[PDB]
Amino acid sequence: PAERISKQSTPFVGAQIFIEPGQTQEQIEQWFKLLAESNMTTCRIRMFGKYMKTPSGTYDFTLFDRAFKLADKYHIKVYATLFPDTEFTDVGGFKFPHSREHQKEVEDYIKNVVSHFSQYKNLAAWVLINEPGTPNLPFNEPFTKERFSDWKKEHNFSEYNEKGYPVLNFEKENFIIDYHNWYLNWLANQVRLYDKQHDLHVNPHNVFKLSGLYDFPTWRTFLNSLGGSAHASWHFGYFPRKAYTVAMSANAELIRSGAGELPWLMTELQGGNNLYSGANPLCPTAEEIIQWLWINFATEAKGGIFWSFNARSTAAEAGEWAMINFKNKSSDRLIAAATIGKFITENVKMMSNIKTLNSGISILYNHESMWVEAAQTRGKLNNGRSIGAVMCSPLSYFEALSETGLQANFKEIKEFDFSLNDYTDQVIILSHQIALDNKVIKQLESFVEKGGTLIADGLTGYYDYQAHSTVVSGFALENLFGSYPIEYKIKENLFSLDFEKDNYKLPAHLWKGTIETSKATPIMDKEGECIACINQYGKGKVFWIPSPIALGARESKDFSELSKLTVSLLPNKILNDNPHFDKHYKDVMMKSFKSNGTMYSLIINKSASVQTVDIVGGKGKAFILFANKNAHSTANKLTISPEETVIIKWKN
Amino acid sequence: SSGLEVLFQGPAERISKQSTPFVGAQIFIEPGQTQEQIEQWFKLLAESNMTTCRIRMFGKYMKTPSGTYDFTLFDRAFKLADKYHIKVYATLFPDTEFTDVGGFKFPHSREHQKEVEDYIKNVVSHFSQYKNLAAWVLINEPGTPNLPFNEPFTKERFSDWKKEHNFSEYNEKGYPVLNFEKENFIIDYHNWYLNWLANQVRLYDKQHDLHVNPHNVFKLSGLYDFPTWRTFLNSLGGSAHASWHFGYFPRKAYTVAMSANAELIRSGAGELPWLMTELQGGNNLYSGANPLCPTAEEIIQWLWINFATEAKGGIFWSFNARSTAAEAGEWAMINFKNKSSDRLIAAATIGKFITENVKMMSNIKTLNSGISILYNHESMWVEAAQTRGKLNNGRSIGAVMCSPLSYFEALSETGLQANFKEIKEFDFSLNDYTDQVIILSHQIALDNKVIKQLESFVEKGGTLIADGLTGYYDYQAHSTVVSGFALENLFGSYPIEYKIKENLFSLDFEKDNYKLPAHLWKGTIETSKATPIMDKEGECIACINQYGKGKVFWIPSPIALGARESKDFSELSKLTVSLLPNKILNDNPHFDKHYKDVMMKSFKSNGTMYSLIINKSASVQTVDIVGGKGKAFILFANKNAHSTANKLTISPEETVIIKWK
Amino acid sequence: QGPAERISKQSTPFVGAQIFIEPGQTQEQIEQWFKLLAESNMTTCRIRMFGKYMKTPSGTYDFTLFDRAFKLADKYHIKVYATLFPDTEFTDVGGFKFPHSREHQKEVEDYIKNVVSHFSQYKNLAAWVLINEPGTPNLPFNEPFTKERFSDWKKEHNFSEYNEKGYPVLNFEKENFIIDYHNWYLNWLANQVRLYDKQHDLHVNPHNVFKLSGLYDFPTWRTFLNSLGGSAHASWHFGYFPRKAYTVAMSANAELIRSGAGELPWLMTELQGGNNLYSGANPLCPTAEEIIQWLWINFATEAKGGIFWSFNARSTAAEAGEWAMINFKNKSSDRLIAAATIGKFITENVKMMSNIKTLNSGISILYNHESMWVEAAQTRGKLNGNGRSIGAVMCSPLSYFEALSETGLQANFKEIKEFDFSLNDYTDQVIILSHQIALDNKVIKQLESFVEKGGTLIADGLTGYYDYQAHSTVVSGFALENLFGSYPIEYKIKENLFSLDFEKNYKLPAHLWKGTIETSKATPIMDKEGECIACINQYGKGKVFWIPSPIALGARESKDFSELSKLTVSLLPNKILNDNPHFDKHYKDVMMKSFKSNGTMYSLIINKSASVQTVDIVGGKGKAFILFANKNAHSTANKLTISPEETVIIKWKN
Numbered sequence A: 001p002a003e004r005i006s007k008q009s010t011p012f013v014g015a016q017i018f019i020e021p022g023q024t025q026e027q028i029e030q031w032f033k034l035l036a037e038s039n040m041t042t043c044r045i046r047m048f049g050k051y052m053k054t055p056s057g058t059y060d061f062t063l064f065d066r067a068f069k070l071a072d073k074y075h076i077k078v079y080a081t082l083f084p085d086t087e088f089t090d091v092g093g094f095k096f097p098h099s100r101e102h103q104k105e106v107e108d109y110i111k112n113v114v115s116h117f118s119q120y121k122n123l124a125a126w127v128l129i130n131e132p133g134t135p136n137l138p139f140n141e142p143f144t145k146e147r148f149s150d151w152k153k154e155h156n157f158s159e160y161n162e163k164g165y166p167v168l169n170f171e172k173e174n175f176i177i178d179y180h181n182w183y184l185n186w187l188a189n190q191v192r193l194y195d196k197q198h199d200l201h202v203n204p205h206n207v208f209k210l211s212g213l214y215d216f217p218t219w220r221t222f223l224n225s226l227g228g229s230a231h232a233s234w235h236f237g238y239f240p241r242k243a244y245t246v247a248m249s250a251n252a253e254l255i256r257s258g259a260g261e262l263p264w265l266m267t268e269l270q271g272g273n274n275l276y277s278g279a280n281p282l283c284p285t286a287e288e289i290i291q292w293l294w295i296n297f298a299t300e301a302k303g304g305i306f307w308s309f310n311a312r313s314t315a316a317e318a319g320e321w322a323m324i325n326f327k328n329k330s331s332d333r334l335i336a337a338a339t340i341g342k343f344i345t346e347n348v349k350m351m352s353n354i355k356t357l358n359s360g361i362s363i364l365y366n367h368e369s370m371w372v373e374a375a376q377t378r379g380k381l382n383n384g385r386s387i388g389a390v391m392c393s394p395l396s397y398f399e400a401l402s403e404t405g406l407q408a409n410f411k412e413i414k415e416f417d418f419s420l421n422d423y424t425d426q427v428i429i430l431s432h433q434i435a436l437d438n439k440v441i442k443q444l445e446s447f448v449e450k451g452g453t454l455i456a457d458g459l460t461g462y463y464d465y466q467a468h469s470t471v472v473s474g475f476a477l478e479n480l481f482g483s484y485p486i487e488y489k490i491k492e493n494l495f496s497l498d499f500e501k502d503n504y505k506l507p508a509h510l511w512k513g514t515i516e517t518s519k520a521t522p523i524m525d526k527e528g529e530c531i532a533c534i535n536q537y538g539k540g541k542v543f544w545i546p547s548p549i550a551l552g553a554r555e556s557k558d559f560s561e562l563s564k565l566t567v568s569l570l571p572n573k574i575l576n577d578n579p580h581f582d583k584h585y586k587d588v589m590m591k592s593f594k595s596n597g598t599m600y601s602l603i604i605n606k607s608a609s610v611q612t613v614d615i616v617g618g619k620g621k622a623f624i625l626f627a628n629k630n631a632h633s634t635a636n637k638l639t640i641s642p643e644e645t646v647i648i649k650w651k652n
Numbered sequence B: 001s002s003g004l005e006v007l008f009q010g011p012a013e014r015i016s017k018q019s020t021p022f023v024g025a026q027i028f029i030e031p032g033q034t035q036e037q038i039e040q041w042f043k044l045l046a047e048s049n050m051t052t053c054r055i056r057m058f059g060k061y062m063k064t065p066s067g068t069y070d071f072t073l074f075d076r077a078f079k080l081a082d083k084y085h086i087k088v089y090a091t092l093f094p095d096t097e098f099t100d101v102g103g104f105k106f107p108h109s110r111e112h113q114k115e116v117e118d119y120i121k122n123v124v125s126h127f128s129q130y131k132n133l134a135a136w137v138l139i140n141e142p143g144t145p146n147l148p149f150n151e152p153f154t155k156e157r158f159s160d161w162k163k164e165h166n167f168s169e170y171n172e173k174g175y176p177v178l179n180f181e182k183e184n185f186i187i188d189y190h191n192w193y194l195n196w197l198a199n200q201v202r203l204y205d206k207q208h209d210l211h212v213n214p215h216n217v218f219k220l221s222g223l224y225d226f227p228t229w230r231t232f233l234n235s236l237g238g239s240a241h242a243s244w245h246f247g248y249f250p251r252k253a254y255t256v257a258m259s260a261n262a263e264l265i266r267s268g269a270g271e272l273p274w275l276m277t278e279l280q281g282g283n284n285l286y287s288g289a290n291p292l293c294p295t296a297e298e299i300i301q302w303l304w305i306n307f308a309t310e311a312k313g314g315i316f317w318s319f320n321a322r323s324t325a326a327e328a329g330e331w332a333m334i335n336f337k338n339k340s341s342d343r344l345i346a347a348a349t350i351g352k353f354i355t356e357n358v359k360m361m362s363n364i365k366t367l368n369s370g371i372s373i374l375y376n377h378e379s380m381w382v383e384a385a386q387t388r389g390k391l392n393n394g395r396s397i398g399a400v401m402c403s404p405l406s407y408f409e410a411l412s413e414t415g416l417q418a419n420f421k422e423i424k425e426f427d428f429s430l431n432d433y434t435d436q437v438i439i440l441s442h443q444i445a446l447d448n449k450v451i452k453q454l455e456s457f458v459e460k461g462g463t464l465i466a467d468g469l470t471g472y473y474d475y476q477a478h479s480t481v482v483s484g485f486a487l488e489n490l491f492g493s494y495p496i497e498y499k500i501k502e503n504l505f506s507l508d509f510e511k512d513n514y515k516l517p518a519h520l521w522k523g524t525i526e527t528s529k530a531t532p533i534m535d536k537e538g539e540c541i542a543c544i545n546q547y548g549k550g551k552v553f554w555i556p557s558p559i560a561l562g563a564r565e566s567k568d569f570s571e572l573s574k575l576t577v578s579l580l581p582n583k584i585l586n587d588n589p590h591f592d593k594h595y596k597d598v599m600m601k602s603f604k605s606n607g608t609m610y611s612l613i614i615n616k617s618a619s620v621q622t623v624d625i626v627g628g629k630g631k632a633f634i635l636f637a638n639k640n641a642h643s644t645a646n647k648l649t650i651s652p653e654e655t656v657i658i659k660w661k
Numbered sequence C: 001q002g003p004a005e006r007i008s009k010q011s012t013p014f015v016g017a018q019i020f021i022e023p024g025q026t027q028e029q030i031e032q033w034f035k036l037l038a039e040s041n042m043t044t045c046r047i048r049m050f051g052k053y054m055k056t057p058s059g060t061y062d063f064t065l066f067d068r069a070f071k072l073a074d075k076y077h078i079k080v081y082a083t084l085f086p087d088t089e090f091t092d093v094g095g096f097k098f099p100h101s102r103e104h105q106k107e108v109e110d111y112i113k114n115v116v117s118h119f120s121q122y123k124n125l126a127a128w129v130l131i132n133e134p135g136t137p138n139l140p141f142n143e144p145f146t147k148e149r150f151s152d153w154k155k156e157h158n159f160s161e162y163n164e165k166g167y168p169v170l171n172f173e174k175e176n177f178i179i180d181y182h183n184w185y186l187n188w189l190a191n192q193v194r195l196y197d198k199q200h201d202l203h204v205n206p207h208n209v210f211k212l213s214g215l216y217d218f219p220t221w222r223t224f225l226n227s228l229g230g231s232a233h234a235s236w237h238f239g240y241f242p243r244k245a246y247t248v249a250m251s252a253n254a255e256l257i258r259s260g261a262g263e264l265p266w267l268m269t270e271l272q273g274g275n276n277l278y279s280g281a282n283p284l285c286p287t288a289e290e291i292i293q294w295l296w297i298n299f300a301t302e303a304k305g306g307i308f309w310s311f312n313a314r315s316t317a318a319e320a321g322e323w324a325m326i327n328f329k330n331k332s333s334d335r336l337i338a339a340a341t342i343g344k345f346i347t348e349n350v351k352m353m354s355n356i357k358t359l360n361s362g363i364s365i366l367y368n369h370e371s372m373w374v375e376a377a378q379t380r381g382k383l384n385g386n387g388r389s390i391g392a393v394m395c396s397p398l399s400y401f402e403a404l405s406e407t408g409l410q411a412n413f414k415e416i417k418e419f420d421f422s423l424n425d426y427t428d429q430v431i432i433l434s435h436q437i438a439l440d441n442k443v444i445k446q447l448e449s450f451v452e453k454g455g456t457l458i459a460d461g462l463t464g465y466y467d468y469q470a471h472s473t474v475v476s477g478f479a480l481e482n483l484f485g486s487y488p489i490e491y492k493i494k495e496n497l498f499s500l501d502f503e504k505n506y507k508l509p510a511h512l513w514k515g516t517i518e519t520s521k522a523t524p525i526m527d528k529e530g531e532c533i534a535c536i537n538q539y540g541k542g543k544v545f546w547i548p549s550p551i552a553l554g555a556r557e558s559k560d561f562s563e564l565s566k567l568t569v570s571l572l573p574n575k576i577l578n579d580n581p582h583f584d585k586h587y588k589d590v591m592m593k594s595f596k597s598n599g600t601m602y603s604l605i606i607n608k609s610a611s612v613q614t615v616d617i618v619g620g621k622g623k624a625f626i627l628f629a630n631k632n633a634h635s636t637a638n639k640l641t642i643s644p645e646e647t648v649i650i651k652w653k654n
C-alpha cells in the first residue's frame, strides 16, 4: 500500500524539517502548516539516534512520533534518514562503522527505527545514510584498516605489467569503491529485514570531488532511487556564482547518469543563508531557487528537497540554511519555491512525464583519471598541475555547450552503453581524461568504427589504469587517433593555439602538445608545428588536440572559441533536430526536454544585461509557458532579462 | 586593615592612585657582562630622568651545579641600581630553556611546581632585603595562544576541574548546548596559578607590591579574569608592544591601539593602580610580527596616552639588549656605544616634565565621557567555536574584538574618551544611568543574567547602542534568535533574516539619501514597540526603542566592521554623536567634527582639566575643540603647536597637552 | 691498471645524457637510444644501477638488464658513469641519503660488492657515482642508524653553554653532526668501492646547492673523490632567480662546484634535458638556446662535462614521459640538436676545449656554513623571501654575483674555508662578504691578514653581526672594529625597499634595515639625512669598504643591479679593470665571463634581454674574433652586437 517512486511520478518540492529536543508542539505544527501552504508535499527528517536513546539504552520514539503525526495531519510524506548516534559536533554523520562493536550498535538502531517508523502511512522513503563518502576516509580506524588488509589479500596484484614495466595498482582507491558498495548494500539489507515496502534512497554529495568514491551502477542493485546533495556553498567551488546554473545542470546530469533506469531526485538544495558555515557562502536569491528547481526537473528529477525548512538552534549552523525567517514566516526563497509547487499541480501531466532531450553528446569522466591525477600531482591544490583538472576540463566543455544551448550527458565511462550496433550522430568528449586502459580503448574503437564522433583534448590517454604511460612505451591510442604524440612543452597558465589560415585562435592552458600523423589529417599552427588531427576511422571520426583547450577556456573565462570549434565537429543531425542557440551566448544556458510527445526548452540568462537569444533547430513555434520576469519572443528570438528562467512549449 | 597594612608595608613603597608616575626600562642582566658595562647603563638611566628598572631574575643564572642558589650576578645589578637611586621591579622567572624567550606559563609537572616553590623561597628571601626593590612581578606575561593541554600537570588539573563541575548536554527548555569546559577551566587555571604565585611570594615578603603584565590583550583577553586578580595584586600591568600586539591596526593608528590597551588594563585594574610594564624601546631585526623601530615621536605619544589613562608608570623593553641568539642587539633604547638613541632622549623629556610638574602628574583622573564599549569572554569563545579557527573579517577569529575597537577609533577621531571594559567590570548596581552610554558591537554571546542587567541599565536612563550579531547566541552557543529572542523586550523588535553580502556593502536608508558602510551580513528586523528605520528596498534595517527613561539603538548589520573595512570612521562618528545624551557633548571637550588620524583624550588633576591631542595625519591640522569650559594654554608640545581661542594648530606626529584655564 | 682513462684538468670535455634503464624496455629501443646518442656527438652516458632491478626472489644478483645496456654502450663507444643506487621503494625518485639501520648498511655492503665486482670488468666504465644527490632538507633523525650516530657524535664532543667571556652560546650540534655525517657516509661508500675497484674514478653530485651548501664540506670530500659533480636543474634549484637570470644561476652554481673541487676536476653530472609535465618546483621545457647557454657557462667555468637528465624518459608514475631530450618517437628534440652542436664544436677544437682555465678577475664572493646556520636559528624557518627569511645569506652574495656578471666581470663563489688565506701578497685581490651574518675570531684574523697584505674587502648587510655561536660582538664588543676602523651605532628597520642617497652621488637601493656607524680611523660616508651609513678604512696596504645596510638585497628587491655595479667598480683595484675584459658600463640581463686556453684568452657573452644589444668590451688586450655564435652575432672593433638568447665565444687575437 506504500507509493513506490517511478519515472512517471509527479515531481514534488520539499524541505528538511529539522527536529531536535527543546522544540514545542506549536513550533512544529507552524512549520508543517506553512510547508503544506507553500505547495510542498514532502519533508526529510534526520532520525538522530542521539535523540531516541534513553539512559538505560532502550529507544524512546516520542520526539519523532510528534513530527511524523504532524506531517500526516498536513498530508506531508517523509523521507526518513537513518542517522545513528554520533557526536553533537559531527554535522554530516559518520560514513562507516568505527569498529565491530559500533557495527552492532548500528544494527540495533536500524532494527528499532525501521520496525517502528515503517508503520506510519506517510513514510515515503528510507535514506540509508546521509551523504556517503568523505574527503577524509577513516584509514586510522580498526574496522576500515582490517577491511582494507583483507581486500588486498583477496586481490592478486603484481609490481610489473605483462610487458615487464613497473605499475601502480591503486589498491586504496579500488578498495574504497568496494567498501562504499559493501556498507550501502549492508544498510539496504538491514532495512529490508524489517521493511520490504518503502523505497530505499541515498544522496551522494560534492560529486565534482567525490565521484571517484562512487560506483553508481552497483548501487542501482539495492536502491529504488538515487539522490544527491548539490549545495551552492559547499559543492560548486570550481565555478563562479553566475555559473551555478551550469554547476547545477552538470550535477543533475551526473546523478541522472548514475541513476540509469532508476528515478532520481535532488535530496538536498541550499534553502537559506550562510552566517559562519559553507566554503563559498551565500544566501540564494529567489531567482536562484527557481533556476535550480527548473534545471533539476528539466534533467528528469522527481523532486527537489531544500536543506532546510527551519534552522538548527545551537552551535554549527544555528539559525542558518532556513527557508523560513526567524518569525517562522516565508522568506522570498520559500515564496519562489511555492510558485514551482503550484506550477506542478496546474501542469501535472507535462511535469510527471519529463524526458531530457539527449543531443547525443556525452562528456565522459572516469574514476581512474582522478586517481592517477592524485598520484601525479601529489595533492597540490593550486591549474592542470593540481587536484581537480580532470573534472574541471570536462565541466568546461559542458559550460561551452550550455552557452551554445545544447544538452550534454555527463557520465562515468562505465555508465555509457558501448554495446550498440550503430553510433551515427552520437558524440563522446574525453577532455583531459589522463588514464585510459586497453579495454576502454577497444570500446572507443568500436564506438567510432560504428559511426561515433570522438573529441579528445588535453592529456587524454597519456597513462593507463596503472599510471604507465603508453605514450613512452608504445601509444595505445595510435590506431584510433591515426597519429602519435611527439612532445609536450610547458608554457604559461594561458597561451594561444593559432591554427594555420587563422581558422581558430584557441585559448590553451599550461602544456602545448605536438603530434605526428600517419593515417590522420594534420592541423598545423602558425609556427609550423602539428597541434591537432582528424582521423576517419570506419564510419566515424576522431578530433584530437593534445593541448588543454577546455582548461584554456576556463583560464581565459571565454568559452566562445571552444563552442565554435565543437559545433563545427558535431554531426548535422544533432544541430537539425535539437533546439540550440544560432551562436555562442556568454552566461546564457538552454536545455530541452520532452513530455508526452511535446518538446520544451529551459532558458536562463545569468548575464548582467537583457539578451536576445535566436533559437534554431528542431520544429515548432515558441509558446512562453513560464517566465518570472515577463520574457517575450518574436518568431523564435527570445528576449530574456538578467536572472530570468523561461520555459518555452514548442507548438506543432 | 588601614593601620595594619601600613605596619606590613614597612619601608617599601606601596603604589597608589596618588603615586608620582615614573619612566623606566628593563635592565637585561645575563652572564658575561662586566661591572663597568652595567654601571654605564644605570648612570645613563639616572641621567635620562628614569627612576625605575625591571630585571628578569633568571633561575638559569643563579643555579649552581649542586642545586644551591648563587645571587652574585643579580646582587651586582641591585647594588648598582641602589647606588644610582633606581628602584627595581623584579620578575620571578624560574629556570627554563635558553630558547624560551617569554617563559613557561604553568608548571609542566608536580615536580616542576616544587622547583618553582624552591626558586621563589630563595629569590624572594634574598632580594626582599634590598631597600630599592619596588615590586615583585609574579610571572612574565601570563597566558599564551598555545596552552599546554598535552602536559601531565595541566591535563590532571583539567580532569579534576571537569569532575567538580556538573554540566548537562541540554538547557532548561531541552535544547542541545555547548558548555565551553576548556575555556571556563582556562580562566580558573590562570586565577589559580597567579594566586598561588602571590601566596608563595607572601610566605617570604609581605612588604612589597605584587604586579603582573597580561599581554596581547586584543587576542588573550578571553584567558584573563581581572576582577579575580584584584584579590591578590597591588597593581595591574601590561605588555603593549607595537611589534607583537597591535596587528589589528596600521602603524598610524598605534595611538588608538595604545589608548584601547590602556583603557582595557585601566578597567581590569578597577580600584588598583595600573602601569605599562612593557613598551617597545627599540629595533626589531629578526624578532616581532609587525617589526619597527619606534620613532622619538611614538615614544612621546605612548607615554602621554598611558599617563592620560591613569598609568603610574611606563617601562620600556629594553634599556640594553640581549647579546646571544633570539633578540641579540634588538629592542634597546641605547645604541651599540651604550649612548642615548633619539628614543631615550625623547623618553627623558617626559621624565623631566614629571619632575617639574609633580602635583599635576601624580593626581591624573581620566575624564570619563560616560561612554563604555563592552566586550565579554563568551563572545570570543562562541566566535572561536563558530569560525573553527579561521584567520582572516566577520567569519574569522578577532571580529568580536575588531568591532568594539572600530567604535573606539571612531570616538578617538571625535576627540571623545571611551571606556573599554569586560562586561563583568561594568557597575550595573547604580540607581541612575542618565547620560551613560553602553556600546555592544558584535558581542555575539549574551546570557539571560546580562540581558536583565542591560534592561535595568536602559530603564534607569542608559543609552544602549548594539550593532552586528550582538546577542545572536547565549553563553551555551544556543541562538535565542531561533528558539525565542531573549532581547525582544529590550529591543522592542525581532530579527527576520541575515543575508551574507560582500566584505564591504552599503546600507542605503529610505530617507535623506543616507549611507552606512557595512561588513559581510545585512540584518533585517520587524519592530513591535520600537520605531523602525527602513532602507530603499523597503526592509527594516534598524530601530530605536524608548524603554523606561533610556533608549536602545539596534542595527544588526556590522557597521563598526564596515567602517574598519572602508578605512573611514567619519559616518560611524557622526551617527554615534547623534545618539549621545546632550550632557556628554556639553561637559566633555571634543572635536567640533570628525578628524581622520587625530586623537584627543581629556583628564583632570586637582580640579584642573587637561586634553591630550596627537596628530597622526600627514598634514598640519587645525582642530576646533568644543565642550567643557576654559581657555587653551599649551603646557606640552614637541613641535611648537599654537592655539587661537580653542583652535589648536598641531603638526604631524606632534603630541600636545592643553591646560584649560 | 685496466682500460679506463682517469679524468684530469687536461681531459677533453664531453656532452652526455642519462640512459634510463628499467624492466619492460626492448633490446631494439635501447639500441635506438645509444645509436642516436653517438650520432649526437655525445661520448658519455650515466646509468642508475637500480638494486631493485637486479635483486632475485632468493636474494642473488642478476645483472642481465644492466649487462644489455653496458654492452650496447660499448658497441657505440659510449663510456658509462655508473650510479650506486641500492634497492628502495619505487616511489623514492632521488634515493635514500643514509642507511636506515645496521642491517640496511649490510645490504648496501652486499649491493656494492656485487655491482662493483661485476661492472668494474667493462672496459667502457668511466666512473662510479658513490650516491645520487647526497644531502636532503629532511634528514632522517627518526631512524635508528642516524639517531645512534648523532648520540655517539654528541658524547665524543664537549660543548659548554657559555663562551670564554661567560656569555650564553648556541653550539649548533645538529648542523656540525650533519657535516661530519655526510663526510663519514660518502668516505665509507668510497672505501667500499675501493675494496673491489681501485681503477675507476669516484664521483658525487651535490644538488640544490644554494639551499644545501650548509650540508657540504667539499675540502674533506676531495680526500676520497677523483672528481666533483653537481645537479643544476632549472626546475628544482634556481628558485632564487627568474628564468631570464638562469645564466647567472648556472654560472654561480658552476663557480660554487669549481671552488669545492679545488685541485680536482669537476663536471655537471645533471642538467635539465626536457619537459616538466607534473614534476619540478619551477617547471619549464628548456629552449634550444638555454641548452647552449648552460653547456658554454659550465665549460667556461672549467667543467670537464655536462650530462643531461635525461636522454629517454621513465615510463610509469613520477616523471613518466618527462625530462627527455628525445621525443616520444625516439628522435631528436631541438634540445638534443642544440647539445649535438656543442659536442661537434669540442671535436673540431680539442686543444682549446681540453685546457680551459677560468680567467680569475681576483674577485671572490665568500659564503660560510655558519651564516646559514645562524640565519636558520634567527628567522625560525620563515619563508617570506626577504632578509627575515631562510635564504637571505645566499641571495645576498648571489645578488653581488649578478651585479658583477652584468658588468662582464668573472667572480669566484666560494665557501670561506675554500679561500687560500696563506699567501704573502693580496695586492689587486678582492673579497666580498655580503650579509655573511656569522664570522668568528679566526676568520677575522685571516681577513685582517688579507687586507694588511693589500687585499680589498667589501662588506654589506649584517656581515659579522654574530659569531659562530650566534653571540653578537656588536653588543658585547665588536670583533671587526680594528679592521673596519669604525663601530656600528644602530640598525633601524625600514620598508622592503628604501634608498641610501650619498651626500656625494650614488643612490643605492637597500633592503629592510638601515645601519648607522661611528668612524675612528675610517673615512665616514654620509647620506643626505646627515647620518654616517658607510666608511673606507685604509688598513696596511689594503682597504675596507663597509656599508651595514643590505645593498645587494636592495638590488635584488628593486630588480636593478646598476648602482651596485657602479659602486663596486669604483672600489676595484685598477689592475683588475686593466687586465680583464669587462663591459664599458652595466648591461641589464647580459653576462660575460672570460677564460684562457694554452695562452689564448676567450670571452663568453650571453644576451638574456628582450632586445639586440651592442656591448662595448674594454680591458685586457687584443681584437675580438667570433669563434662561436648561434644567431649571427658580429663585432666592430671590440663592440659585440648580440641577439636575444644568443651565446657568443670571442677569441682575443694580438
Ligand SMILES: OC[C@@H]1[C@@H](O)[C@H](O)[C@H](O)c2nccn21
Pocket: A091, A092, A093, A130, A131, A205, A229, A231, A234, A268, A277, A307, A317, A321
Ligand atoms: O551544511 C548544511 C547541511 C548540513 O547541516 C546537513 O548535514 C546536510 O546533510 C548537508 N549536506 C551538506 C550541507 N548540509
Ligand SMILES: OC[C@@H]1[C@@H](O)[C@H](O)[C@H](O)c2nccn21
Pocket: B101, B102, B103, B140, B141, B215, B239, B241, B244, B278, B287, B317, B327, B331
Ligand atoms: O620580544 C621582546 C620582549 C621579550 O624579550 C621579553 O620576554 C618580554 O617579556 C616581551 N614580551 C613581548 C615582547 N617581549
Ligand SMILES: OC[C@@H]1[C@@H](O)[C@H](O)[C@H](O)c2nccn21
Pocket: C093, C094, C095, C132, C133, C207, C231, C233, C236, C270, C279, C309, C319, C323
Ligand atoms: O627529477 C628529475 C631527476 C630525477 O629523476 C633523478 O632522481 C635525478 O637524480 C634528479 N635530481 C634532480 C632532478 N632529477
Ligand SMILES: [Cl-]
Pocket: A044, A045, A046, A047, A081, A130
Ligand atoms: Cl537527513
Ligand SMILES: [Cl-]
Pocket: B054, B055, B056, B057, B091, B140
Ligand atoms: Cl622580566
Ligand SMILES: [Cl-]
Pocket: C046, C047, C048, C049, C083, C132
Ligand atoms: Cl643516477
